[PDB]
Structure formats: C-alpha cells, structure tokens
Structure 1
C-alpha cells in the first residue's frame, strides 16, 4: 500500500497533466503551423497571377 499507492498514483497524474501541457505546446506549434503555410497561401493567389503576368508580358510582346 505505502509504496504502490504513491508509486502509481502521483507519477500518473504528473504524466497525465504534463500530457495536457505538451498538447497545449504542440497545439501552440499548430497555431504556428497556421503561419507555416497561411501567410504564403494567402499570397499564392498573387503568386500564380504575377508569375503568369510575365508570360502575359511575353504575350504583350
């Protein structure tokens, strides 16, 4: 009782709540994963328009 009631309770709570904290950390890195593609794929519109603007400039020539 004396050994196991602490040897399986407290560390389990610690890993359990640190698992929620690590979930919050990797969720924050997922909030960064928003930026990881979002600021560029908001531009990808003007990217696929302006890259072909040069071929349209060859069309103007």
Structure 2
C-alpha cells in the first residue's frame, strides 16, 4: 500500500507534466487566438471602412 501510494505520487507527477504540457500548448493556442483576432480586427476594420467608402461613392454616382 505504501508502494501504491508512491506509484500514485508518480502518477500525480505525470498528470502534473500533462498539466504543464497543456499549459504551454494552451498558451500557444492563445497566441493563435491573438493572431486570428488581430487578423479578424484587421478584416473587420478594413472591410467596414473600404465597403462604406465604396457605398458612399455609389451614393455619389
């Protein structure tokens, strides 16, 4: 039972390695979300501005 507790400790440390690995991968996915959000804010601002200006020019025509 003491040995099973020590093996459970090793299993806990393996799950801690899994937690740190998913932590680093989650930070990488957060960099991914920041990248896609930068591209999305760029798409929103550029689309809105350019399409609104072109619609204004269509009103001018």
Q: TM class by shorter-chain length?
A: 0.7 to 0.9
Q: Number of matched residues? A: 61
Aligned mates of 2:12, 2:56 — CA distance in 1: 64
How many Å apart are 1:18 and its aligned residue?
1.6
Task: Give the TM-score, by structure 1 length.
Answer: 0.78
How many Å apart are 1:3 and its aligned residue?
2.8
Task: Give the TM-score, by structure 2 length.
Answer: 0.78
Higher helix share: 2
How many Å apart are 1:29 and its aligned residue?
0.9
Structure 1: 5+ residue runs without aligned partners? none
Which whole-Å deviations, capped at 9, do the CAs of 1:21-53 have from their partners, x for residues lacking one? 111102101110111221231342222111111
- 4+ residue runs of structure 1 moved beyond 4 angstroms? none
Q: Quick check: 1:3 aligned with 2:3?
A: yes
Further displaced range: 18-27 or 38-47: 38-47
CA-based RMSD of the aligned residues comes to 1.7
Structure 2: 5+ residue runs without aligned partners? none
